[PDB]
């Protein structure tokens, strides 16, 4: 009977809500009210990376904090050199509409994907010199929205068929299929130890998954609309989400509930790109109001505005040493901020 | 040391990017949309994952994307198609049950914040089945405004009244709120649809240039 299962499901939901209510002895803002604010952070556009023809959906910084791959809807994956402004590589993609891109931790490969339902892995360290298709991962049903490497060997991809997938690049098939989301999974983010990963979807829910187990360990609710972006806190025990309801939301894995909401009455537009700083004190979020905002992650105060774009900011990434922030947008220009 | 070779590699990359820029700006992107029973497949196979078609009209390359590999939820990947010149919108004008679904889809496309610039080329297919349904299912049951509607096809004018009522409903949604709508009446066997796409895209890029050089 579906009615008794519905009753058991709402009883379990009430039990989880009561456990989170009894666990909420205080808030992060009440604890951090005694510490000093971070002031005003005036990040300037130190470099502008131009050369894309269509709008950008994804970037990913390299682990050397110098090179970044960027994905644009002309079918272009450009790997840049942010120190010297030059383009290291320019990959012409098979499908024009690319929605995600990744840069490997070793740096040898990049990934892309989008409406072609396929994660394309490109080798940047070929013996000939030119960049070819290393692997063509097919098996997803919906559009590929986020993919991030674990190493040279495996990659987890989030897709629009309410599933995520851990793929083996060597054999080209899904080792693990993560199922349980209700809406289109729009972004994932790996933990620093790469043991677990969170994924935000269009069901106003973020699911914390184990990579080896494949079962959804934790489920986080509290958002009001489609979560478009997600990023772990640098310690790996918390994460922030951005969504279409103009609120960013920092949750904790151990507390298993909401910690803090990042919102303003002057903001009515959704968040497309979420990342933290090196310390995690600054949460930088790109918005649909043509700009980005640097929220205080412990005080919920908008400490800065990154207003160098005249179109939608869609991707935003922070270097692994925290040296720079690159806010790619729909102007076909990446902008390096510092 | 390695800065000079990086500079020559960057120069070669911007040369290839300039060639791709001329190729990209020469072609006009089109987003084909429709229902499952709509005749968008006959539209995309008329002048012939994503079903992509190149077709050259008057030495102008139009490249059209039929996205059928996705699910029924479309609020996120439709934002991919904002840089296209137009949204081709195929409507079953003969299927009154899902005509309101097509009207709601066109309203959501028209009022979407990232699709506010895009014009919609409206193709009302199955005009022959619409004619054989009108002369032989009443649209007044699914649309009470047809009881008070007047005409603003050659054998009988009730077909004209029905097709212009559907066109007027779509144009009422279009004009209820930078971008125009280009409704057309066409069948499955019609070779003029590429020419209609060419003329409507010519009007779209002409109005875009009229806004660009500040005449509008």
């Amino acid at each position, epitope marked *: 009977e579906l009615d008794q299962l519905r009753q058991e499901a709402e009883q379990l939901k009430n039990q989880i809500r009561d456990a989170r209510k009894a666990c909420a002895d205080a808030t992060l803002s009440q604890i951090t009210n005694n510490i000093d604010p971070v002031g005003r952070i005036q990040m300037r556009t130190r470099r502008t990376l131009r050369g894309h023809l269509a709008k950008i959906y994804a970037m990913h910084w390299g682990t050397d904090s110098r090179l970044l791959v960027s994905a644009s809807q002309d079918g272009k994956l450009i790997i840049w050199d942010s120190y010297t402004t030059n383009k290291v590589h320019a990959i012409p993609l098979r499908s024009s509409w690319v929605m995600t891109c990744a840069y490997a931790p070793s740096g040898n490969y990049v990934a892309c994907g989008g409406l072609d339902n396929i994660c394309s892995i490109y080798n940047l360290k070929t013996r000939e010199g030119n960049v070819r298709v290393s692997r063509e991962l097919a098996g997803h049903t919906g559009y590929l929205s986020c993919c991030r490497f674990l190493d040279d060997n495996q990659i987890v991809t989030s897709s629009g068929d309410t599933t995520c997938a851990l793929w083996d690049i060597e054999t080209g098939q899904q080792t693990t299929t993560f199922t349980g989301h209700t809406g289109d999974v729009m972004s994932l983010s790996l933990a620093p130890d790469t043991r677990l990963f969170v994924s935000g979807a269009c069901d106003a829910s973020a699911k914390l998954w184990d990579v080896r187990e494949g079962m959804c360990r934790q489920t986080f609710t509290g958002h*009001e609309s489609d979560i478009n972006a997600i990023c772990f806190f640098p310690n790996g025990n918390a994460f922030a989400t951005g969504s279409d*309801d103009a609120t960013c939301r920092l949750f904790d894995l151990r507390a298993d509930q909401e910690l803090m909401t990042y919102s303003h009455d002057n903001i009515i537009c959704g968040i497309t790109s979420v990342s933290f700083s090196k310390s995690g004190r600054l949460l930088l979020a790109g918005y649909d109001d043509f700009n980005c905002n640097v929220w205080d992650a412990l005080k919920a105060d908008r400490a800065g505005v990154l207003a160098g774009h005249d179109n939608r900011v869609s991707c935003l990434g922070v270097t692994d040493d925290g040296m720079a922030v690159a806010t790619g947008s729909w102007d076909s220009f990446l902008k390096i901020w510092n | 040391n390695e800065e000079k070779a990086q500079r020559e590699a960057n120069k070669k990359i911007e040369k290839q990017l300039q060639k791709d820029k001329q190729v990209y700006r020469a072609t006009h992107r089109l987003l084909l949309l429709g229902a499952d029973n709509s005749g968008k497949s006959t539209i995309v196979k008329q002048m012939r994952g994503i079903f992509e078609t190149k077709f050259q009209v008057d030495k102008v390359n139009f490249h059209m994307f039929d996205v059928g590999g996705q699910r029924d939820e479309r609020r996120k990947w439709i934002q991919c198609f904002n840089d296209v010149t137009a949204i081709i919108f195929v409507v079953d004008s003969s299927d009154y049950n899902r005509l*309101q679904e097509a009207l709601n889809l066109f309203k*959501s496309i028209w009022n979407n914040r990232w699709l506010r610039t895009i014009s919609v080329i409206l193709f009302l297919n199955k005009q022959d089945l619409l004619a054989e349904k009108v002369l032989a299912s009443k649209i007044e*049951d699914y649309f009470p*405004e047809f009881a008070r509607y007047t005409t603003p096809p050659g054998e009988d004018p009730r077909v004209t009244r029905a097709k212009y009522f559907i066109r007027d409903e779509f144009l009422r949604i279009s004009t209820a709120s930078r971008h125009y709508c280009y409704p057309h009446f066409t069948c499955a066997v019609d070779t003029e649809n590429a020419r209609r796409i060419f003329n409507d895209c010519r009007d779209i890029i002409q109005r875009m240039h009229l806004r660009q050089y500040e005449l509008l």
Partner: nanobody
Amino acid sequence: QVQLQESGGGLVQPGGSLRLSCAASGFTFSNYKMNWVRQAPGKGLEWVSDISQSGASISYTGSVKGRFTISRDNAKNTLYLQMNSLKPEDTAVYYCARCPAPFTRDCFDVTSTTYAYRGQGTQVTV
């Protein structure tokens, strides 16, 4: 959590009246354009009506115009659908949909088979 509980559905004679009340929790009602959709047995999801954020823009499907009305109340955070003169073709299960993004007058995916911001529905039968 975005939760939508519908109530008021049940057996009703043709030509009668029926009130559906949906209680909304987990989101602010005043920012979302709230829809009522339905699914007939052996049929797909059919959109019935929608009401805007302030209640000024109210629209219906053509088979329910003059018979159904849709209202919202932001004070007690709920949605109403009142049905007068029920045809026997109006038998369905009624879901209360929701606009996926706030402050937008476009409603994508409200009639999807696996839409997230939608209730479990109430069975309205003749």
